[PDB]
Curated annotation (Swiss-Prot), chains A, C:
Keyword DNA damage part of the UniProt annotation: no
Keywords for this protein: Aminoacyl-tRNA synthetase, ATP-binding, Cytoplasm, Ligase, Magnesium, Metal-binding, Nucleotide-binding, Protein biosynthesis
Gene Ontology annotations of biological process type: phenylalanyl-tRNA aminoacylation
UniProt source species: Thermus thermophilus (strain ATCC 27634 / DSM 579 / HB8)
A GO-annotated cellular component: cytoplasm
Protein name: Phenylalanine--tRNA ligase alpha subunit
Cell cycle found in the keyword field: no
UniProtKB/Swiss-Prot annotation, chain B:
Residues noted as binding Mg(2+) in the record, renumbered to the chain: D23, D29, E32, E33
Span covered, complete protein: 430 to 785 of 785
Superkingdom of source: Bacteria
Residue span, FDX-ACB domain: 259-351
Encoding gene (name): pheT
Entry protein name: Phenylalanine--tRNA ligase beta subunit
Description of how the protein assembles with itself and partners: Tetramer of two alpha and two beta subunits.
Source organism per UniProt: Thermus thermophilus (strain ATCC 27634 / DSM 579 / HB8)
Family indicated by similarity: Belongs to the phenylalanyl-tRNA synthetase beta subunit family. Type 1 subfamily.
Cellular localisation: Cytoplasm
UniProtKB/Swiss-Prot annotation, chain D:
Family membership noted in the UniProt record: Belongs to the phenylalanyl-tRNA synthetase beta subunit family. Type 1 subfamily.
Species assigned in the record: Thermus thermophilus (strain ATCC 27634 / DSM 579 / HB8)
Location(s), subcellular: Cytoplasm
Covered range of the whole protein: 430 to 643 of 785
Superkingdom in the source lineage: Bacteria
Signal peptide: none
Designated name of the protein: Phenylalanine--tRNA ligase beta subunit
Subunit structure, interactors included: Tetramer of two alpha and two beta subunits.
Binding of Mg(2+), residues: D23, D29, E32, E33
Length: 266, 356, 266, 214
């Protein structure tokens, strides 16, 4: 007789990292709102990471980001249009630079979301990492207003936490947006406001940088009569409170006993 | 110009159509007239922007869930097949199933005179059809589709046939029942659900290789070898298959912070009368092992001398692990005793225990 | 020595049916435009399939669809709200009925796309099948106009065939829309206009049917001051001209030598 | 009320900020003032509608292509792993690779003083780390990530280790090189590409079981 309850041949079964699951969940949410996902380089130049985004040398703002500087000969960093871009190299402290790289190479209107790994020089603890992930969006076009920004984040809240979810915006400062704001979502099941990220209307000086640089490369300017908004958020923060991960250090810890738990999550 | 008589000065006119335009009755009818005479080309392009009414939120979860299922399936290695919804009534006989509930009054042909009650019969036919046209050495198919009986419901079904998996230039191969059961256990871990097979007979299945599938504790379908007689009538080699009813249970994520403390290992064999199902033994060792059991695995299945004849032995690698701290030997020991005790109270012997 | 070029263990590798690939390709296109995919039953009642959609008994229009009628005792067909719906049973001749089922159970505004298998009594040839698939959409809300319909199909053309693609609309008749139209896409690489499907503005009588039926079930009416547009298209037609499949009969033919060719298509 | 002196009758006013508001220089700066005093709560919700400019069409194909790759991989049976971008310079030695091209001037630690040139070294370490903490009988991992050398480029790497595939209660098993090569041929048929392995030596590989992927 054949025992049907006997274990069958042991083929392997895979799984995806908590962060990939979460990242995927956020990209599809925005895809439904017409946003396309584009990625950028991890090793950036100070120009795209700081200068173009209105964050200059010896300025209080520069203190908000703890940069890892890089040294290395014979490394080719190439700009938006495949040109050799010259600057002091660094590991990106945010995904924002990619938004300048996109604008110089494309013409408005458009809506983009750029997920990515970012680095900050910090002491890694249960809620702090030096290597983590962010997701930033950018919508540029004639007539884009703050109302449209509040609308997008509203749709984000509704999608992550339900119809009974509500967003809240308050003023905050960022060198690359004005007005600027921080947004929080009412997580109804947790009965508390969660601070998710920042956002604001692209700063006049960011568009000038884009065009000025476009002109340098021979491209006609495209950001003269447009407005636009941008927001950015941390992925780990969501991933933790959504999957219930207590220690941010698990993400890069590579323990199979941790990762395997997320096999069932699609 | 079209012949209508327009009365009024506006904003709302009284337009009475000619007697020969039987199609002009509503206002919309009239707006189409303005459109076709002006030209559809003159209608500008535009995109709408609005927040959907609340009840439409999340409305696609289902479609999305089934589409990932197909993707996970093709990922594992199953090849998708589409099969007509129609069924030959005679087939209900050839395969030993209850007769069709919905029949057509105007069928394309007699063999397409009913609506399928099961999915597998069709897969089996396309299998034969393939063998005749081309002679595949193997196949692993799957289909998701509607099935009609009492209610219309979605099913998932697959079938494995042929040589199997192994080194091409070698003869040793993995195949048949336990290979199909493998792809299924693999499939189920990915969906993150509890899968189990208890033996049970099915008219169409083979008595000796026939069982019911238990997903998350509930019977959702079967798995087994095609009954040899049906095989014979249709001139087919043996084939293994399964059929389930979708949508499968949904199990949420309960994160369990893994212990940063070392596991304790232990091996043990259970002597069991040949007919006793492996699953029953496994459940027993498990239920008795305590809250500290982490893993339980079968590494050896033996039956012969000097094992008391009519008996077999099941070797098990066990692993105990305490979350907050390391386990004291007395804890493991005492724990492996609760197993040994209930093991013998069911009438089972202990071929081995406490092996490092 | 170990010969690295020797074939390794022969694990199976799956694949998806041409139609699933194509269907998936069309649903993601609309998801980007904010449309949600919902499916409906294959076995329908004459009410939802014909009557509610303004296609009555002994009427020229009924001749456009070659219906397969069904007989069978002890079969439960349940309506939108799980109620036992009474009517003469049939295999759906189009996906449109699902659009009435949706409207009775949900309130506007919304945008939906319903892919599905449909049946027609016909003699199966190299370009004709009795069993095939359609995909229909429906957008309902305050202010939805034909311009918005032309815009959607425009976005469909751009996504399937490129920026150099253009759509064309012409008048045609459908009992359930007014204005009504047929649309064709300029397929630039094929250098010819392709007739893709139909569309129009939902007919006044379809909304009346929806509400009247809602009222019957105790739901308040919701389609009094709204407008809406709908379109529907054949999947096989696309799938064939996009993957180069010569005979429509291959789709349900189940030949492994045919299906395996589409393993690489995502 | 904020202290600005407004001149003009409209529609375009000449507003000169107080000397203590160093932050008020552009018109936008002033619009934020109207917003924060009125309250961000007063800004209504809305969604934009527009046809994107032509060059933005198809812009996501790449991201989509790589994301399906990961999905096909987890489908086959590979378990995803995330590993730090940082590398111990000494490792370039332990594994026999050319030295790192990008090094940090302010590393978190010496062992994290360089940017990885290869992916595998890290997978191999997490493998060991796993064996010590828990004793897996097997593993089949994979990682997609950035690697830095001359240019920044994306890599895919995996590793198989342990007992293998077969009947649990039997000894006959499929494993090692030809099993990994199996999962790869399987992987490649799904992507619909031609895959081939020619033998060639690699410093880090084993001479007798070493080949190049075509
Ligand atoms: Mg008309
Ligand atoms: Mg300010």
């Amino acid at each position: 007789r054949v025992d049907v309850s006997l274990p069958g041949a042991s083929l392997f079964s895979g799984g995806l990292h908590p962060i990939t699951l979460m990242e995927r969940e956020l990209v599809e949410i925005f895809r439904a709102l017409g946003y396309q996902a584009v990625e950028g380089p991890e090793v950036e130049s100070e120009f795209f990471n700081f200068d173009a985004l209105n964050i200059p040398e010896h300025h209080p703002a520069r203190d908000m980001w703890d940069t890892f500087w890089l040294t290395g000969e014979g490394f080719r960093l190439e700009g938006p249009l495949g040109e050799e871009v010259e600057g002091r190299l660094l590991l990106r402290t945010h995904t924002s630079p990619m938004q300048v790289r996109y604008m110089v190479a494309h013409t408005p209107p458009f809506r983009i979301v750029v997920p990515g790994r970012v680095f900050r020089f910090e002491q890694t603890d249960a809620t702090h990492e030096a290597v983590f992930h962010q997701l930033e969006g950018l919508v540029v076009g004639e007539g884009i207003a703050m109302a449209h920004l509040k609308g997008a984040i509203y749709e984000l809240a509704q999608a992550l936490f339900g119809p009974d979810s509500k967003v809240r915006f308050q003023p905050v400062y960022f060198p690359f947006v004005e007005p600027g704001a921080q947004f929080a979502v009412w997580w109804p099941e947790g009965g508390k406001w969660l601070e998710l990220g920042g956002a604001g209307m692209v700063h006049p000086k960011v568009f000038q940088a884009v065009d000025a640089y476009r002109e340098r490369l021979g491209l006609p300017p495209a950001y003269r009569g447009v407005t636009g908004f941008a927001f950015g958020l941390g992925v780990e923060r969501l991933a933790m409170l959504r999957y219930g991960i207590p220690d941010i250090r698990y993400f890069f810890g590579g323990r199979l006993k941790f990762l395997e738990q997320f096999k069932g999550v699609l | 110009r079209l012949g209508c008589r327009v009365e009024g000065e506006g904003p709302t006119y009284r337009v009475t159509p000619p007697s020969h335009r039987l199609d002009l009755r509503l206002e919309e009818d009239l707006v189409e007239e303005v459109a076709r005479i002006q030209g559809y080309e003159t209608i500008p392009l535009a995109l709408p922007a609005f927040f959907p009414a609340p009840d439409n939120r999340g409305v696609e979860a289902p479609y999305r869930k089934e589409q990932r299922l197909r993707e996970v399936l093709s990922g594992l290695g199953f090849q998708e097949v589409y099969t007509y919804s129609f069924m030959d009534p005679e087939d209900a006989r050839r395969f030993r199933l209850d007769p069709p509930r919905l029949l057509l009054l105007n069928p394309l042909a007699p063999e397409k005179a009913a609506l399928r009650t099961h999915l597998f019969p069709g897969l089996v036919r396309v299998l034969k059809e393939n063998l005749d046209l081309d002679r595949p050495e193997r196949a692993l198919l799957f289909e998701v589709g509607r099935v009609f009986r009492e209610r219309e419901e979605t099913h998932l079904a697959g079938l494995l046939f042929g040589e199997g998996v192994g080194l091409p230039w070698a003869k040793e191969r993995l195949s048949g029942y336990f290979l199909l059961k493998g792809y299924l256990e693999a499939l189920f871990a990915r969906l993150g659900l509890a899968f189990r097979v208890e033996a049970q007979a099915f008219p169409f299945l083979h008595p000796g290789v026939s069982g019911r599938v238990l997903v998350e504790g509930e019977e959702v379908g079967f798995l087994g070898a095609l009954h040899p007689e049906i095989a014979q009538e249709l001139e087919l080699p043996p084939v293994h298959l399964f059929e389930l009813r979708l949508p499968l249970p949904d199990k949420p994520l309960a994160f369990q912070d893994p212990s940063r403390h070392p596991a304790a290992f232990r091996d043990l064999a259970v002597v069991v009368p040949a007919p006793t199902p492996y699953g029953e033994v496994e459940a027993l060792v498990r239920e008795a092992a305590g809250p500290y059991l982490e893993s339980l695995a079968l590494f050896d299945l033996y039956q012969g001398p000097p094992l008391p004849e009519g008996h077999k032995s099941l070797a098990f690698h066990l692993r105990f692990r305490h979350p907050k701290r390391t386990l004291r030997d007395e804890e493991v020991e005492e724990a492996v005793s609760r197993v040994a005790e209930a093991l013998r109270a069911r009438g089972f012997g202990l071929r081995g225990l406490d092996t490092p």
